[PDB]
Design a protein around this ligand. Sequence first.
Ligand SMILES: CC(=O)N[C@@H]1[C@@H](O)[C@H](O[C@@H]2O[C@H](CO)[C@@H](O[C@@H]3O[C@H](CO)[C@@H](O[C@@H]4O[C@H](CO)[C@@H](O)[C@H](O)[C@H]4NC(C)=O)[C@H](O)[C@H]3NC(C)=O)[C@H](O)[C@H]2NC(C)=O)[C@@H](CO)O[C@H]1O
Length: 151
Amino acid sequence: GNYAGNFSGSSRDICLDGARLRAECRRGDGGYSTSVIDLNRYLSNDNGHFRWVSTATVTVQQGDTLRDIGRRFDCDFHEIARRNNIQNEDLIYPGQVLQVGGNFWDSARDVRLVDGGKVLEAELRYSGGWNRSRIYLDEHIGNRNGELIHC
Ligand SMILES: CC(=O)N[C@@H]1[C@@H](O)[C@H](O[C@@H]2O[C@H](CO)[C@@H](O[C@@H]3O[C@H](CO)[C@@H](O[C@@H]4O[C@H](CO)[C@@H](O)[C@H](O)[C@H]4NC(C)=O)[C@H](O)[C@H]3NC(C)=O)[C@H](O)[C@H]2NC(C)=O)[C@@H](CO)O[C@H]1O
């Protein structure tokens, strides 16, 4: 079915201010706002590929594996491991607090909007070089009463 975001139908002059997405957004009342959303909070660089992963923490439960958590959050468990300085990817412990999500900007270059502001593209660092990647921002960026929000 539809994307959940669809900000682009109700927004114009879509711009990037570094990792921050800015637009003139329509408000319920016929007026306009200028709103910004920090895309570095919502997009990860998943070994060379844009992935929607919200900056968050996850507490390990008994029986979890890094693969399962990888699957639950859609991301390379190898990077979860490095980012959280995990000595052995097969050893995690209940109550362990793992940082996940965001942070694409730190390993991106040539970042720009294409397709009338609907698509973000970048060269993203991977284990072996730089990969060109694009992501449809309407998937998860929405306009609620003139504010850009993740949904
Ligand atoms: C990348 C990936 O996903 N790899 C998978 C492997 O992880 C998985 O093997 C299983 O992995 C889990 C999670 O690490 C593991 O469970 C952990 O096991 C250790 C014991 O070795 C427990 O350690 C103890 O914890 C308690 C407190 O919580 C301490 O008091 C105690 O001292 C610790 N013991 C030691 C020796 O230090 C962890 O608590 C426990 N963690 C969780 C989250 O339950 C399983 O034992 C692994 N299972 C097997 C069969 O090896 C592998 C197979 O499932 O699959 C890979 O894909």
